Amino acid sequence: PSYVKFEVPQELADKVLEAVKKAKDSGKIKKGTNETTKAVERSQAKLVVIAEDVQPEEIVAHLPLLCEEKKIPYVYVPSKKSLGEACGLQVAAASVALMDPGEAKDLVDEIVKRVNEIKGKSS
Amino acid sequence: SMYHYIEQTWQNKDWRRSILRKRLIEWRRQPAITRIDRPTRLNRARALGYKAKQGFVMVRVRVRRGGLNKPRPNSGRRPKRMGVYGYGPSKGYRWIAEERAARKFPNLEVLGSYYVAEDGMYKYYEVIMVDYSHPVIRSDPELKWLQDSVNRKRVFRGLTSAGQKSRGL
RNA sequence: CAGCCGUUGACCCCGAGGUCCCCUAAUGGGAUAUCCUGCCGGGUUUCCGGCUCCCGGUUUAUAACUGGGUGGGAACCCCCCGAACGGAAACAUCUUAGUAGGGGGAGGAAAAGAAAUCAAUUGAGAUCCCCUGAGUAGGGGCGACCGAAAGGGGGACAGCCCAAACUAAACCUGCCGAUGAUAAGUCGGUGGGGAUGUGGUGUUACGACCUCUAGCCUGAGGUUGACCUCGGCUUUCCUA
RNA sequence: GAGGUAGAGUACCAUCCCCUGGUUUGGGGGUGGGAAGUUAGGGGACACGUGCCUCUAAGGCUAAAUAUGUCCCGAGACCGAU
RNA sequence: CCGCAGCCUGGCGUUGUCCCUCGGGCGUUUAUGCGUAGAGUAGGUGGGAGGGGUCGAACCUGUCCUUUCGGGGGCAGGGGACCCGAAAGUGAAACACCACCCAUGGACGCUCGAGGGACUAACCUCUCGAAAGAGAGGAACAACGUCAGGUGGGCGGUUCGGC
């Protein structure tokens, strides 16, 4: 795809899936892209998720660029269907956001460290 | 409001066009008429009331560019009405798009249309297409109008937005 | 001619039914045959149901199977394509003319319908048709000719939904059973669709609408002058 | 009081063509370019500028007021069997 | 008398990437200037008698390039600090600082030509392939659309005076 710039390893992705599913009860998590983008526009986003299997690619293509100047980190996950299951949704999910990391805060921060250190190597 | 940002990338000019050129080629391989389960640029489709609820569908179609496909006359005529070059199909291609699109699924009805891409040899459009016989839409208060007959086959009489546009209201 | 039905209520007329061959848009398949001819499932003697292009479901991801757009109709209506004859005393621009006619598609009416409208001393207030405005404006070898609008006067005069900001699964829908007057709805199980956006409020200009802040302002209850929950009300649907 | 929303190849422009009075001024289409988008735009007879005035499209949908005789009642300065 | 097909050429769009020589430029990067009178390189207009000055100068001594070898311009060390005048000439003066123009060369991202070349990914031709998809040759051409010009009894309407 073209809307994704840097590759994310599965093991990194796997942790995110475990990270988000924990937030089912403690943290506050946005589901559905509309509930995300404005919150991202509200600069209230701690971390956001962008699916690698979107169709067409433009459906969420704006999200990385906006988060740039907003200086808010973002993560990728290949299986958007899992994320819908991951967010406790009976159907697929393409965009979810993390207002607060809830219980996996430390897990989140390591992920932020994980992605950012890759970003440094990603130039 | 994703729909606000979808064209923020693609408002008039973006390197998105290079990507679509790749999509442009593969579509020429695709049939001249086909069904896409999810409409492309929702900023238009939802702007035409399309609801992802069961009972709607998306269709793509292409047409050839150029002036009108008009034959030369042969009888005795005055020069006024017998020239050929410069003619054009008076009713717009945006209009014509739904027409052949309408014929494809007569058990449905057309509402609105738009193009998404265009090269020098073809024009590519996307059209909302609605089932009225579905026992879902049958009970909608918000579209109860469609239960009547008169809403049928409208595009052929030009009661769609394109028809109104072709009529220059 | 001959015979019968009729006072056990005929024939007739009204309504409700029942039958209702073949081709035919004819659609199991085929047709220069108003005719022949298969495949399933049903009971079964006679026989009965289903079999182009689609929409949404069953089952494998191509196999069949569940459930619902075609043609005609006197004129009329809408929309695309689009003539010559003549006239100019000729004729080529023009006009005759978007009529004759072609194609598509409806209904009992259609179309259109809520201004990016006008006009002009700061006014009116959807559309349509009728009478005027008016052969006025304006167009054209300035030739035949074509030809408005605004306003006024009449008729009926009805005006509501969507996208966005903003709520965010609070959503719609198949079947079965119960209930419900069989309706709608609700209930229990079910199947489908849906964050790639259902449902909730709302769509208008010297602004409108939404959110937040602050202040004032309802019958019961509670909460901390203030807030909230349950009242009437608006819209919609359902027909016994 | 503060903040936010308010429809794109759409408007618009050049060109060719079509038609309507629309004429250096209208609407439609083809072709090529091509915006702003609320602190937006358009319109107010050539163009441009300035002020003043009024509307908000590029999606819907809509009661009635009129078009007609395949037909059915009624009437008639309509004809009497070429 | 003309009109319309078709044809030829060219422009625009479907039109991509590397270039390549030269001529153009676009927004930039920079650096180079003696008709005579005179301390002397006044190229021509501006604000400007102050500008440089451990917020580093005058002096002479060489390495170096150039030029009407006239002469100016760029090098650090030797030198730790000095010169132009509001004063003398020039139809037009300050190598007092900073600007504009002409004029010489190279380069940067972009554009156009005289053009030329190359590639393939568009696209075209063909084949295989049930489909999906694959392979082979040309090629940003061709072909199409559109526009213009040249040709155009191939087709269409017409007139072919009057006495």
Swiss-Prot record, chain A:
GO aspect biological process, one term: translation
This protein's GO CC annotations: cytoplasm; ribonucleoprotein complex; ribosome
Domain of life: Archaea
InterPro entries attached to this UniProt entry: eL8/uL1-like, Ribosomal_eL30-like_sf, Ribosomal_eL8-like_CS, Ribosomal_eL8/eL30/eS12/Gad45, Ribosomal_eL8/Nhp2, Ribosomal_eL8_arc
Protein's UniProt keywords contain Nucleus: no
Keywords assigned by UniProt, alphabetized: Cytoplasm, Ribonucleoprotein, Ribosomal protein, RNA-binding, rRNA-binding, tRNA processing
GO molecular function: ribonuclease P activity; rRNA binding; structural constituent of ribosome
Annotated compartments: Cytoplasm
Family: Belongs to the eukaryotic ribosomal protein eL8 family.
The protein's assembly and partners: Part of the 50S ribosomal subunit. Probably part of the RNase P complex.
Cited function: Multifunctional RNA-binding protein that recognizes the K-turn motif in ribosomal RNA, the RNA component of RNase P, box H/ACA, box C/D and box C'/D' sRNAs.
The protein, known as: Large ribosomal subunit protein eL8
Organism: Sulfolobus acidocaldarius (strain ATCC 33909 / DSM 639 / JCM 8929 / NBRC 15157 / NCIMB 11770)
From Swiss-Prot, chain B:
Keyword Iron: no
RNA-binding among keywords: no
Cysteines joined through disulfide linkages: none
Cellular component annotations (GO), alphabetically ordered: cytosolic large ribosomal subunit
Single annotated GO MF: RNA binding
GO biological process, one term: cytoplasmic translation
Alphabetical keyword list: Ribonucleoprotein, Ribosomal protein
Family of the protein in this entry: Belongs to the eukaryotic ribosomal protein eL15 family.
Protein name: Large ribosomal subunit protein eL15
Lineage: Archaea, Thermoproteota, Thermoprotei, Sulfolobales, Sulfolobaceae
Annotated gene: rpl15e
Range covered out of full length: 4 to 172 of 217
